[PDB]
Amino acid sequence: QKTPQIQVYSRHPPENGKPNILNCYVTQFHPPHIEIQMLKNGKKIPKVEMSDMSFSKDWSFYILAHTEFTPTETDTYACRVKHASMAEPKTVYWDRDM
Amino acid sequence: NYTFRCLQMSSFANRSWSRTDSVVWLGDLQTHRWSNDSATISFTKPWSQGKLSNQQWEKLQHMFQVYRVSFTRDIQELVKMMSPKEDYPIEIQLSAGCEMYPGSESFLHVAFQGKYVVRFWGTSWQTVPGAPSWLDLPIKVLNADQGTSATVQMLLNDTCPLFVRGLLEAGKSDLEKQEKPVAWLSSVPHRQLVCHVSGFYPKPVWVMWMRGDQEQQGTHRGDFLPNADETWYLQATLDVEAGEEAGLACRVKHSSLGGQDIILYW
Numbered sequence A: 001q002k003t004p005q006i007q008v009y010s011r012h013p014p015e016n017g018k019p020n021i022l023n024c025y026v027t028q029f030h031p032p033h034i035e036i037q038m039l040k041n042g043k044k045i046p047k048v049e050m051s052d053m054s055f056s057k058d059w060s061f062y063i064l065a066h067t068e069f070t071p072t073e074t075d076t077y078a079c080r081v082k083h084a085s086m087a088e089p090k091t092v093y094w095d096r097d098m
Numbered sequence B: 001n002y003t004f005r006c007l008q009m010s011s012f013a014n015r016s017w018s019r020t021d022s023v024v025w026l027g028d029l030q031t032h033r034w035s036n037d038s039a040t041i042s043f044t045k046p047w048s049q050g051k052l053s054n055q056q057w058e059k060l061q062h063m064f065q066v067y068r069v070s071f072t073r074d075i076q077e078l079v080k081m082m083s084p085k086e087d088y089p090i091e092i093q094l095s096a097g098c099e100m101y102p103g104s105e106s107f108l109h110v111a112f113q114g115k116y117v118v119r120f121w122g123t124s125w126q127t128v129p130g131a132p133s134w135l136d137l138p139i140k141v142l143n144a145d146q147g148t149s150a151t152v153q154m155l156l157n158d159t160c161p162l163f164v165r166g167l168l169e170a171g172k173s174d175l176e177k178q179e180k181p182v183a184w185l186s187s188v189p190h191r192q193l194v195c196h197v198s199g200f201y202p203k204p205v206w207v208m209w210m211r212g213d214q215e216q217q218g219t220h221r222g223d224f225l226p227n228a229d230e231t232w233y234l235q236a237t238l239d240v241e242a243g244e245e246a247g248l249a250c251r252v253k254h255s256s257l258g259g260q261d262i263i264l265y266w
Ligand SMILES: *[C@@H]1O[C@H](CO[C@@H]2O[C@@H](C)[C@@H](O)[C@@H](O)[C@@H]2O)[C@@H](O[C@@H]2O[C@H](CO)[C@@H](O[C@@H]3O[C@H](CO[C@H]4O[C@H](CO)[C@@H](O)[C@H](O)[C@@H]4O)[C@@H](O)[C@H](O[C@H]4O[C@H](CO)[C@@H](O)[C@H](O)[C@@H]4O)[C@@H]3O)[C@H](O)[C@H]2NC(C)=O)[C@H](O)[C@H]1NC(C)=O
Pocket: B104, B105, B106, B107, B108, B120, B121, B122, B123, B150, B153, B154, B156, B157
């Protein structure tokens, strides 16, 4: 019924070679059942931590995923979401600045 | 003005599968979690019991344990009675609590399939205008349960504001914490300059693109995004002409900075 919006951003200024935290914030979806992965070079990152699912004033659900990451200029990062509102999984790549 | 929100999310997939999970917020800080898997309500702060004794807490918890089972049973029975006209899957959400004002008001709102349908108000449950008419009879029936109505009235009118006043005392150092933003600038290689501000708490913040002392009213503030460590993230963008980036700066004011603003020159 409602399609998830995905935002990907880092906790600290992204500096190459320095450990950091990458966030994937998924919002504005219904129903609440959802599958969220974070990817490094297209491959699933294993240790991804998730907040409890909650919902907003408008009743749409939201959830925050995060993982440790070390940005370099040889690695891509992304957040991939599977949800009944979408025919295919939706992937949003970290834009390298956020 | 702190708002205490207990958020219940119940998913009923079919007659054999359902779960109910809750989270509790005091303002933007999570104080409790109650997983379907857990018999007891979990604390997400050392002060989540407020000023309630262990015995007072177990009684309140017990009331919610009975509610969770009864609610689940009631919805399952209702769906069986309505079959096949109303059928699975079903999402029900409850938002209940109280907003604390200086010198309170309480609320209990219920949504079905993502739409607000029912509230408790005054001394009774009521369907809201536009809600499906099939809800009217089940709500009338629920309203005949005086004991439930009296318990809900107590919880909203009395228990909520009292519990929350205890939380505000017990959690004061966390609620009044100050965390400093860190900022950084970027753009793609006419341009859009982005000022990223991360790690600030509490939420109120001012972020502006400046040329000297002049605020650039073209500054577009993004949405507030949560970090996983109970701090906030915000970006402010400015669309500029190419070659016109020199002399611009991002300025951040925040309560945690003690009047020493962050100023980042492009
Ligand atoms: C808990 O607080 C309730 C009020 O607070 C609101 O609801 C709670 C759940 C929170 O969300 C809170 O934030 C909200 O602000 C309180 O509800 C009130 O209960 C009293 C009676 O107990 C009701 O009084 C009766 O009112 C009706 C008229 O109601 C209509 O008109 C008024 C305005 O004039 C509107 O405000 C209403 O919405 C309605 O449109 C009278 O007809 C009735 O008179 C008859 O009964 C009395 C005895 O009660 C006799 O003396 C008379 O002779 C009459 O026969 C009452 O006066 C009040 O409507 C209701 N408020 C609301 C907004 O519905 C609840 O009682 C509290 N419970 C506890 C345990 O603390």
